[PDB]
RNA sequence: AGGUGGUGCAUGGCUGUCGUCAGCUCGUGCCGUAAGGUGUUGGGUUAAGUCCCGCAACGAGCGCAACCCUCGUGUUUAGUUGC
RNA sequence: GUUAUCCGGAAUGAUUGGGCGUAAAGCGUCUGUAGGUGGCUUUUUAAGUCCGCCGUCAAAUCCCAGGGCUCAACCCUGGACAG
């Protein structure tokens, strides 16, 4: 047993200081973070109004990974990158083909965002709204249809979307699971 | 590999009764057995294949050098506790689990760090030149700590696996590894729903003797799987 | 609600006075003018200087103590790489003027520069660096975060920055603040260092006020 | 140049006030689609969010208290201009 | 550029494509005529339904493939999915 006081100032010195160490490290986790949507939603005290910030944000490689999160601050930059922190624990994968689009026609529902995908042929690009729109293309999908019908909410049309493309199946899963071989569905 | 069970002991030790007929969760309906006085019979066909993979998996994960915890929080799986930890020379939470401990590290951790101070100042015997009211509170400060931080207090790091007792009164440590992508290796009794554990031993919860036997064969599985990481490394 | 200048509020307790001197109550007033005239002349003197030759002279204090002989003026500074590097080292072109204002009769002048290590854990020092990066025209949020960078990198335990008036020229002014660490104001134990400054923008005025904390 | 000439609804400094009232918040986590909530609530107790139990919250910061002055008891030391 | 007109966006009259506990919206409650829909098994028929073949749905227009005005608009030849 070597003595408490030098182990113990080796994992205090090993786990850093958070006054002494300045942030910057995340362009080296290979991201890039979005803003979407800045609001200044109001809590409301005897004083009187007192301001905070609401950031909608979501990340993407650009290469076929994506997450959104929300987070709330009373500056602009706190809020961001909170809403950066948040959506990095929060993040999924979304199935392509190789054309990059969708393997598949599919509906989302979240709250009163409702949101339509459907695949587009090559040299299309993206055509969607605000939430949509910005989710897809930081995903890295190059090529698909899509519209939100029902609400507009920013927010829960981000997390639909999310959910449309968690439930996207891709062709060698459903071979698998179906238990037939691909030439089989293909046609 | 191969493990300790046999169905005579299990019968021995009582792991197959359950708690009261009007307590039941149904979504324990597949796997439960026979029902007897308004007491619940569980399947020990299903224990066992339940038991050896988790000792089996217990067994991998000690090997390539992974860290445990074990939790639970009753009067006697307390006692039960810190033995099973000392002798698999493991981490344990057997008094009063703290919310957070897993999820917010580091907060935790920062805790960790002034109970580390708290420990070198006792020993020092530094709290001896204080006011009574300092040395009081230094004591209240050591009280909680020894508490809440007594069992992990060698641990840093985040804990990669998880065992608990009795997923019942523990919703919180579940939540936390649920969260954290850690595994739960749980005890189930008849009340207790079998989706908050990765593997869920169906097992006995009022009973003494059922944790010692599970356990004790669980600690045995960690103990060999710590001699074969003793050897790997 | 007002608070007290934390610098007046430990007085002969974990702080020091700045002119040591002593006088008979007549002269008291005489001997405070003179102070006066030469805090005077030296701010003066290194303002024009210096911001000639383009830098950033902290001017941190300046301490008197006047001896029945000689009056002894140490001028606590940041950077006297613009006072000394000058060919009239400051010494002796300030000596000269000095000497001219107070008189010189029964009384000659000394003047000492001293060298404040850090010169970011100095409040004067740093609210005049704000002081320059606003009257720049750098939005006041930078320059903020840069000041408590910069800062907490020259080794300091706590800091409240506050800047108040019409904050990027627009119309209706306000008060802006960033605690940082651990800043008493009320512990009298507490070493206390405050500073207030005023900036002169084109749409008027702009108060810093800094409090720093360097433990108990 | 000088302006005690206009604007305290263009401003700094400085001060009053609610009130020497016990509050106000923030970091990380967790609950809520979200505004927000929790912490700060509950059982006790305090001059006090004072302090202790309990609790998905764990801590921290500014307040409170304390460190400051003056008046109360003693001891050591120093004795003129006071004894 | 402005105005007028029409369709779009408008899922805002909704077959594809909405709703009716509290947001606009369930007759106060039943009985019942027309009308709509209606369990299982075998056979029949072939009205829907499906597949093949024929007639026609003028030319011009829209769509595909060539050709002509130097290009394009425009013109000309040939052919066809729909329905
Ligand atoms: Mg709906
Ligand atoms: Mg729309
Ligand atoms: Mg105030
Ligand atoms: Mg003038
Ligand atoms: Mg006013
Ligand atoms: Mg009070
Ligand atoms: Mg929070
Ligand atoms: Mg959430
Ligand atoms: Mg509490
Ligand atoms: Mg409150
Ligand atoms: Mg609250
Ligand atoms: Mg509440
Ligand atoms: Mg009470
Ligand atoms: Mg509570
Ligand atoms: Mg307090
Ligand atoms: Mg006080
Ligand atoms: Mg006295
Ligand atoms: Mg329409
Ligand atoms: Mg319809
Ligand atoms: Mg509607
Ligand atoms: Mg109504
Ligand atoms: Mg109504
Ligand atoms: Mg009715
Ligand atoms: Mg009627
Ligand atoms: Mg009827
Ligand atoms: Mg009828
Ligand atoms: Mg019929
Ligand atoms: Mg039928
Ligand atoms: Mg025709
Ligand atoms: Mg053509
Ligand atoms: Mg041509
Ligand atoms: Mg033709
Ligand atoms: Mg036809």
Same mark, same amino acid.
């Given at each position: 047993?070597?003595?408490?006081?030098?182990?113990?100032?080796?994992?205090?010195?090993?786990?850093?200081?958070?006054?002494?160490?300045?942030?910057?490290?995340?362009?080296?986790?290979?991201?890039?973070?979005?803003?979407?949507?800045?609001?200044?939603?109001?809590?409301?005290?005897?004083?009187?109004?007192?301001?905070?910030?609401?950031?909608?944000?979501?990340?993407?490689?650009?290469?076929?990974?994506?997450?959104? %999160? *929300?987070?709330? !601050?009373?500056?602009?930059?706190?809020?961001?990158?909170? &809403?950066?922190?948040? +959506? =990095?624990?929060? $993040?999924?994968?979304?199935?392509?083909?190789?054309?990059?689009?969708?393997?598949?026609?599919?509906?989302?529902?979240?709250?009163?965002?409702?949101?339509?995908?459907?695949?587009?042929?090559?040299?299309?690009?993206?055509?969607?709204?605000?939430?949509?729109?910005?989710?897809?293309?930081?995903? %890295? *999908?190059?090529? !698909?249809?899509?519209?939100?019908?029902?609400?507009?909410? &920013?927010?829960?049309? +981000? =997390?639909?979307? $999310?959910?449309?493309?968690?439930?996207?199946?891709?062709?060698?899963?459903?071979?698998?699971?179906?238990?037939?071989?691909?030439?089989?569905?293909?046609? | 590999?191969?493990?300790?069970?046999?169905?005579?002991?299990?019968?021995?030790?009582?792991?197959?009764?359950?708690?009261?007929?009007?307590?039941?969760?149904?979504?324990?309906?597949?796997?439960?057995?026979?029902?007897?006085?308004?007491?619940?019979?569980?399947?020990?066909?299903?224990?066992?294949?339940?038991?050896?993979?988790?000792?089996?998996?217990?067994?991998?994960?000690?090997?390539?050098?992974?860290?445990?915890?074990?939790?639970?929080?009753?009067?006697?799986?307390?006692?039960?506790?810190?033995?099973?930890?000392?002798?698999?020379?493991?981490?344990?939470?057997?008094?009063?689990?703290?919310?957070?401990?897993?999820?917010?590290?580091?907060?935790?951790?920062?805790?960790?760090?002034?109970?580390?101070?708290?420990?070198?100042?006792?020993?020092?015997?530094?709290?001896?030149?204080?006011?009574?009211?300092?040395?009081?509170?230094?004591?209240?400060?050591?009280?909680?700590?020894?508490?809440?931080?007594?069992?992990?207090?060698?641990?840093?790091?985040?804990?990669?696996?998880?065992?608990?007792?009795?997923?019942?009164?523990?919703?919180?440590?579940?939540?936390?590894?649920?969260?954290?992508?850690?595994?739960?290796?749980?005890?189930?009794?008849?009340?207790?729903?079998?989706?908050?554990?990765?593997?869920?031993?169906?097992?006995?919860?009022?009973?003494?003797?059922?944790?010692?036997?599970?356990?004790?064969?669980?600690?045995?599985?960690?103990?060999?799987?710590?001699?074969?990481?003793?050897?790997?490394? | 609600?007002?608070?007290?200048?934390?610098?007046?509020?430990?007085?002969?307790?974990?702080?020091?006075?700045?002119?040591?001197?002593?006088?008979?109550?007549?002269?008291?007033?005489?001997?405070?003018?003179?102070?006066?005239?030469?805090?005077?002349?030296?701010?003066?003197?290194?303002?024009?200087?210096?911001?000639?030759?383009?830098?950033?002279?902290?001017?941190?204090?300046?301490?008197?103590?006047?001896?029945?002989?000689?009056?002894?003026?140490?001028?606590?500074?940041?950077?006297?790489?613009?006072?000394?590097?000058?060919?009239?080292?400051?010494?002796?072109?300030?000596?000269?003027?000095?000497?001219?204002?107070?008189?010189?009769?029964?009384?000659?002048?000394?003047?000492?520069?001293?060298?404040?290590?850090?010169?970011?854990?100095?409040?004067?020092?740093?609210?005049?660096?704000?002081?320059?990066?606003?009257?720049?025209?750098?939005?006041?949020?930078?320059?903020?975060?840069?000041?408590?960078?910069?800062?907490?990198?020259?080794?300091?335990?706590?800091?409240?920055?506050?800047?108040?008036?019409?904050?990027?020229?627009?119309?209706?002014?306000?008060?802006?603040?960033?605690?940082?660490?651990?800043?008493?104001?009320?512990?009298?134990?507490?070493?206390?260092?405050?500073?207030?400054?005023?900036?002169?923008?084109?749409?008027?005025?702009?108060?810093?006020?800094?409090?720093?904390?360097?433990?108990?």
């Amino acid at each position: 047993l070597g003595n408490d006081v030098y182990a113990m100032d080796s994992k205090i010195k090993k786990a850093t200081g958070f006054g002494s160490k300045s942030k910057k490290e995340k362009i080296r986790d290979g991201f890039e973070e979005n803003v979407v949507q800045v609001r200044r939603v109001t809590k409301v005290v005897k004083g009187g109004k007192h301001m905070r910030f609401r950031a909608i944000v979501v990340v993407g490689d650009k290469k076929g990974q994506v997450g959104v %999160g *929300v987070g709330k !601050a009373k500056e602009v930059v706190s809020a961001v990158q909170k &809403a950066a922190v948040d +959506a =990095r624990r929060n $993040i999924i994968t979304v199935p392509m083909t190789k054309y990059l689009t969708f393997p598949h026609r599919n509906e989302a529902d979240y709250g009163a965002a409702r949101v339509m995908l459907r695949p587009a042929a090559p040299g299309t690009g993206v055509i969607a709204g605000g939430a949509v729109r910005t989710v897809l293309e930081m995903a %890295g *999908v190059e090529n !698909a249809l899509g519209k939100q019908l029902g609400s507009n909410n &920013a927010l829960n049309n +981000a =997390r639909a979307t $999310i959910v449309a493309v968690q439930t996207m199946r891709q062709f060698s899963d459903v071979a698998r699971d179906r238990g037939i071989p691909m030439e089989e569905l293909w046609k | 590999r191969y493990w300790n069970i046999n169905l005579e002991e299990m019968m021995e030790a009582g792991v197959h009764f359950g708690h009261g007929t009007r307590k039941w969760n149904p979504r324990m309906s597949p796997y439960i057995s026979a029902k007897c006085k308004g007491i619940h019979i569980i399947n020990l066909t299903r224990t066992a294949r339940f038991l050896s993979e988790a000792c089996d998996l217990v067994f991998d994960a000690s090997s390539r050098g992974k860290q445990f915890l074990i939790v639970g929080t009753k009067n006697k799986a307390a006692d039960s506790v810190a033995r099973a930890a000392i002798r698999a020379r493991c981490h344990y939470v057997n008094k009063k689990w703290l919310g957070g401990m897993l999820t917010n590290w580091s907060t935790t951790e920062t805790r960790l760090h002034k109970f580390r101070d708290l420990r070198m100042e006792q020993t020092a015997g530094r709290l001896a030149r204080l006011p009574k009211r300092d040395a009081a509170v230094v004591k209240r400060q050591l009280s909680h700590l020894q508490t809440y931080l007594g069992g992990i207090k060698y641990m840093t790091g985040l804990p990669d696996i998880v065992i608990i007792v009795d997923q019942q009164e523990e919703y919180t440590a579940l939540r936390e590894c649920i969260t954290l992508g850690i595994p739960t290796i749980c005890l189930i009794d008849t009340n207790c729903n079998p989706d908050l554990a990765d593997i869920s031993i169906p097992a006995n919860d009022d009973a003494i003797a059922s944790i010692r036997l599970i356990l004790t064969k669980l600690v045995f599985a960690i103990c060999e799987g710590r001699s074969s990481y003793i050897r790997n490394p | 609600g007002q608070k007290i200048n934390p610098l007046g509020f430990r007085l002969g307790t974990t702080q020091s006075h700045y002119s040591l001197w002593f006088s008979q109550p007549k002269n008291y007033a005489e001997g405070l003018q003179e102070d006066q005239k030469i805090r005077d002349c030296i701010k003066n003197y290194v303002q024009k200087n210096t911001k000639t030759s383009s830098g950033v002279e902290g001017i941190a204090r300046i301490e008197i103590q006047k001896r029945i002989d000689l009056i002894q003026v140490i001028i606590h500074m940041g950077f006297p790489k613009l006072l000394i590097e000058n060919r009239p080292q400051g010494v002796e072109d300030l000596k000269i003027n000095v000497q001219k204002e107070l008189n010189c009769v029964n009384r000659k002048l000394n003047i000492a520069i001293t060298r404040i290590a850090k010169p970011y854990g100095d409040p004067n020092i740093l609210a005049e660096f704000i002081a320059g990066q606003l009257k720049s025209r750098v939005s006041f949020r930078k320059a903020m975060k840069k000041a408590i960078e910069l800062t907490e990198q020259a080794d300091t335990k706590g800091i409240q920055i506050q800047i108040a008036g019409r904050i990027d020229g627009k119309e209706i002014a306000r008060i802006e603040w960033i605690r940082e660490g651990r800043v008493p104001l009320q512990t009298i134990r507490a070493k206390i260092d405050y500073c207030a400054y005023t900036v002169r923008t084109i749409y008027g005025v702009l108060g810093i006020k800094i409090w720093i904390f360097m433990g108990e």
